[PDB]
Every structure is written in C-alpha cells, then in structure tokens.
Design a protein that fits this description.
heterodimer; A: mainly beta; four-stranded antiparallel beta sheet; globular; B: little secondary structure; 0% helix; WD40_repeat_CS (chain A); chromatin regulator (chain A)
Chain lengths: 304, 7
C-alpha cells in the first residue's frame, strides 16, 4: 500500500524564500509565511489566492493557526510574534520579550496560550487574550528550532541546536524529560504525534526518529532524505495510510511508511530545498514549500 | 531573509 500524491497546484506570489506552510484546522485554508515578511492565505482545495497579511518589519520563520481557524500567530526576525485576525487581516497583538529572532510558534489546543522558541535560547508561553508573556523557560543552550503542544496542551516539546529535545509541564514550566544523543547532532525539528504518545524528531544528520518519550526509547528511524543545514518541518499523515512526510535539501518531498520505515513516495518538482511540508486535517493533501530559488508552494493530492 | 531560510 503506497500513496500516489500527484501535483495539483503551484502557488506563486512570495518574493523571497517561503519558510512555513500550515493548513487551518477546519481544512479551508493554507497559510504561508515567508522571508518576504508576508503571510499569504490560499484556498486548500482550489489553491486560489485569498489575501496577503502584512506588518512584520523583518522576515517570518513560522506561522500557526488557532484551533477555531480564526487567528494566526507568526514568528519573526524582528524579535516579535504577531497575532492576526484572519478575517480582517489586522494585527491584534504584538508579543514582545524575546531578545533575538523568533523561530517557531504554536497555539495550544484550547488556543488560550501561544508557545514560542527563539534564537535567544528561551521558550516563552504567552496569554493569547492579553498578549502578556506568562513564562520564560530557560529551555536550551542554543537556538530553539521547534515548539509544540501535545493533544491536551498539558505538555510542550522543544528542540534545539544544542542537541536536546525536552518535554515541559505547561502549567509549571518544569522540565519533565530530556532526550539525549551521545553524538549530540542538532535537533532541527520536533512535534508530538496526533495522539500525543510519541515525538517525531529531526536531526541535522539526515535522520528522523520516532521516540516514545516517556520510556526514552527510539522506536523508528527514517532516512534517505538530505537534511544537514535547515530546520525542515516533518509531519504525521493520518487521513489515509499512516505516513511520515518531510521536506529535503535535495528539493524532494519524502514520504515513508510510519511502521515499516520504507520510503513509499518522493515528490519531484520543487527547485530548491523543501523547507516546509504540511498535511491536511481531513483530506489526503500535502502542501510543500521551498527556499529562494523556488519561492513557490505546491499542493499535492493522493487517493490514500 | 528569515532565520529559518538561512543556513
């Protein structure tokens, strides 16, 4: 059983590298963020351009949707996050307090908190309603490459160039677990599985790993792609077959069978590093996006 | 640029 993702749309319009694409939780929209300082909204099913959202004064490294698909948060080199009203395009809040580039961000499922990670080596937890920073976690000893809440919001996972993945108690901010590798390769991405029991972690040694983080046991490894330089998003795909999806520095999207670890498909067509991939919440649809020689987003569809 | 799009 292998998927058959086929190219449906190429979305042009960003004028610098794309940095992150994410589907809205309600499946209607794709948001893209870019080094060109802009967010763009596109229809997930017909690829139609909807609007541009602007206001950051330097480039954007990540964007994320609220659980009701009504808000976005973005992380920028301008040391801020911004909360946006998707319908109006207006910046509702500017989140100030990081002292270097903000690299990654996410809402919790309740969507009353935002978590951010920064080049300043901290993880910050923010109140969505007020914009106040509630906690600053001294999370890592090098830039924080990813932050993610688990299914009920009670845990945060963070990853860093320092080689570590850490699990944090959201309520108290205390570190519950540190995952370590003896070779300490930079960890360039992490996220919880949809059910919250596992974490998927990328390291800059061309390797993805599935961890049972409570036992501290690596259950699966995925290889064959190229990832030595960039913080590339990876994903669980669960709408059809159970896959792992990642970008690659050889300009391809890689798809693996989660359980067997075999590569089941490679998607060709981008002309630069595929920095970001996203999986649609209900349809077998992948969004992918690439760096400066390409600057496009592609939408792909599979029958499984 | 943006930090994620730089090596």
């Amino acid at each position: 059983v292998k998927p058959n993702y086929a190219l449906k749309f190429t979305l042009a319009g960003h004028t610098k590298a794309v940095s992150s694409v994410k589907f809205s939780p309600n499946g209607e929209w794709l948001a893209s963020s870019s080094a060109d300082k802009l967010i763009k909204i596109w229809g997930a099913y017909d690829g139609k351009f909807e609007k541009t959202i602007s206001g950051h004064k330097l480039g954007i490294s990540d964007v994320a949707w609220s659980s009701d698909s009504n808000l976005l948060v973005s992380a920028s080199d301008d040391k801020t996050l911004k909360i946006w009203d998707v319908s109006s395009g207006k910046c509702l809040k500017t989140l100030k307090g990081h002292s270097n580039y903000v690299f990654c961000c996410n809402f919790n499922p309740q969507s009353n908190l935002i978590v951010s990670g920064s080049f300043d080596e901290s993880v910050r937890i923010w109140d969505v309603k007020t914009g106040k920073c509630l906690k600053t976690l001294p999370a890592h000893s090098d830039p924080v490459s990813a932050v993610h809440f688990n299914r009920d919001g009670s845990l945060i996972v963070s990853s860093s160039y320092d080689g570590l993945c850490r699990i944090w108690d959201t309520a108290s901010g205390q570190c519950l677990k540190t995952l370590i590798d003896d070779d300490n390769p930079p960890v360039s991405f992490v996220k919880f599985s949809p059910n919250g029991k596992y974490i998927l972690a990328a390291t800059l040694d061309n390797t993805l790993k599935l961890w049972d983080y409570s036992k501290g046991k690596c259950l699966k490894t995925y290889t064959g792609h190229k990832n030595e330089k960039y913080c590339i998003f990876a994903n669980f795909s669960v709408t059809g077959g159970k896959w792992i999806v990642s970008g690659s520095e050889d300009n391809l999207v890689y798809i693996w069978n989660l359980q067997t670890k075999e590569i089941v498909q490679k998607l060709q067509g981008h002309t630069d590093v595929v920095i970001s991939t996203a999986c649609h919440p209900t349809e077998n649809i992948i969004a992918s996006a690439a760096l400066e020689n390409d600057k496009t987003i592609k939408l792909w569809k599979s029958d499984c | 640029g943006s930090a994620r799009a730089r090596p």
